[PDB]
């Protein structure tokens, strides 16, 4: 096969692929690799236009969502951060394959472990301490929530970077952040 079936990503160097506050104002790099019952993931978000380049005084949190259908296929509409033309699928070289994902449930957060109505349960969250712009003097928290913004028979991933309250007038960018979760299949 020309592609790797254990990896789903946004390609390593995606162009602005999110319209968070305004049209294409952010670059979200996300790579998910399946390793048995656990998916090793790495996420990164950076502002490139609008308010995401100069954190508003009243903002305290910046987050993105990724909703998947019952087959583990991304749905490119609200609230999914990635715009519809955004690249997402199996890895093939430094790009993605155009083949539809047929083993998506292997990358989805286990609904038994993280039930859809359990988004507020600690177990459905992986919270860590990280640093804005990688600057160790600017600590923030990244909270990954599983299946919290899911429809029904669906799945989701939520990334919440909080504590931005006192980093006003600065560009928003996160370092490469790691996370993991138990797979559906």
């Amino acid at each position: 096969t020309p592609y790797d079936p254990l990896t789903l990503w946004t390609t390593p160097d995606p162009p602005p692929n999110c319209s968070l506050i305004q049209e294409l104002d952010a670059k979200l790099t996300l790579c998910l690799t399946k390793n048995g019952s656990i998916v090793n993931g790495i996420v990164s978000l950076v502002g490139v236009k609008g308010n995401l380049l100069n954190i508003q005084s009243t903002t305290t949190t910046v987050g993105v969502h990724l909703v998947f259908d019952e087959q583990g296929r991304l749905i490119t509409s609200t609230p999914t951060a990635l715009v519809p033309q955004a690249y997402w699928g199996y890895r093939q070289g430094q790009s993605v394959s155009t083949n539809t994902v047929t083993n998506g449930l292997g990358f989805m957060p286990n609904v038994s472990a993280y039930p859809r109505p359990n988004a507020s349960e600690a177990k459905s969250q992986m919270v860590s301490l990280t640093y804005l712009q990688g600057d160790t003097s600017k600590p923030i928290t990244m909270k990954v929530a599983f299946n919290g913004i899911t429809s029904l028979n669906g799945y989701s991933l939520t990334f919440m970077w909080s504590g931005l309250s006192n980093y006003i007038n600065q560009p928003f960018s996160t370092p490469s952040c790691s996370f993991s979760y138990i797979t559906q299949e």
Binding site: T11, D13, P15, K49, V83, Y87, G93, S95, T98
Partner: protein, 124 residues
């Protein structure tokens, strides 16, 4: 891929720079066409700053403030295989490495251009 290798364009203040980026598409390249031009200025220390895009069959600009309203795609038909751009009224602040990224899943290509701007029009 792109038809031109990494080059260096030396121009003078006031002039306009034509940055080439012509590409060819394979039958395999079926993903949506994606063009992104980035810049690594010489003055400040920022790198890979977005300049202009061609995403979802639409042009998006005004990402790099210091370059506002002076960057436009030269071709009137991007899809045809030309992602070249212009930088009107060149200034000394415009010096840096400009990168052209042409993607069409699974295809991907990129070119780097070192733009140099001289105060007085002379390269002898």
């Amino acid at each position: 891929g792109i038809t031109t290798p990494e080059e260096m364009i030396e121009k003078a203040k006031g002039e306009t720079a034509y940055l080439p980026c012509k590409f060819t598409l394979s039958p395999e390249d079926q993903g949506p066409l994606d063009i992104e031009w980035l810049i690594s200025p010489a003055d400040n220390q920022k790198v890979d700053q977005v300049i202009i895009l061609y995403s979802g069959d639409k042009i998006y600009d005004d990402y790099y403030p210091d370059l506002k309203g002076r960057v436009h795609f030269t071709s009137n038909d991007l899809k045809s295989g030309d992602a070249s751009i212009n930088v009107t009224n060149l200034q000394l602040s415009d010096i840096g490495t400009y990168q052209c990224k042409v993607k069409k899943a699974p295809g991907v290509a990129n070119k780097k251009i070192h733009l140099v701007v001289l105060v007085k029009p002379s390269g002898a």
